[PDB]
Write a protein that binds this ligand. Structure first.
Ligand SMILES: Nc1ncnc2c1ncn2[C@@H]1O[C@H](CO)[C@@H](O)[C@H]1OP(=O)(O)O
Length: 204
């Protein structure tokens, strides 16, 4: 047949990618320098940690929010995903993604995406997902620790939302900082950030 992409997703514009990337960097700088984070460094790893370097594996270019990992058809449900009318119809079209929070764990750094009803139509329907609304996994990856694979980022977000399912420990310029234990951190943005993106397929 025609082989599918490596994955489908929304790919941020240059502009939006810059803006979100910087926001992520600033968050990492602020968080690592924050008194509340320094107290819990023993629950984060095994003197201050520079989190921008810790998350050394970062997206090189434009950022994205993946929908369905297809691995060129080899992944289960890949064909069944690509054949959908709403996918074929939305291919190449513009969307705005809403960023609700930035998060950090011992494994990944990322941004939480809250999909619109329309965008959720593009979310795949193939135990981490249990109990949470559809599309909760939706994220943009900002960084990964050396031996992590950024499939981890989605799992990390889901685990975090399973927790949030109390009171702020800190105040950052962009919002409230929450300490969720086990080295997990969440910045809830006072103002949700809007990024512009195009739905398409990555081949690489
Ligand atoms: N098993 C998987 N399930 C869903 N998405 C995956 C995946 N493995 C890789 N991906 C996504 O596809 C890319 C493969 O190069 C990764 O960057 C990852 O994007 P992500 O960072 O947004 O999660």
């Amino acid at each position: 047949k025609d082989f599918l992409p490596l994955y489908f997703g929304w790919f941020l514009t240059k502009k939006s990618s810059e803006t979100l990337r910087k926001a992520g960097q600033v968050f990492l700088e602020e968080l690592g320098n924050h008194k509340a984070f320094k107290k819990e460094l023993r629950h984060f790893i095994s003197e201050k940690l520079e989190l921008v370097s810790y998350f050394g594996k970062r997206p090189p270019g434009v950022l994205h929010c993946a929908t369905k990992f297809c691995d060129y058809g080899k992944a289960a449900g890949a064909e069944e995903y690509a054949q959908q009318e709403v996918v074929k119809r939305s291919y190449g079209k513009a969307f705005k993604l809403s960023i609700s929070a930035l998060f950090v764990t011992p494994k990944t750094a990322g941004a939480q995406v809250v999909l619109t009803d329309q965008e959720l139509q593009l979310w795949p329907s193939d135990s981490a997902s249990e109990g949470l609304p559809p599309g909760s996994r939706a994220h943009v990856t900002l960084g990964c620790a050396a031996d992590v694979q950024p499939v981890q980022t989605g799992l990390d977000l889901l685990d975090i939302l399973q927790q949030v399912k109390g009171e702020a420990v800190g105040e950052l310029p962009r919002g409230k900082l929450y300490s969720l234990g086990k080295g997990r951190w969440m910045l809830s943005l006072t103002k949700k950030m809007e990024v512009k993106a195009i739905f398409t397929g990555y081949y690489g």
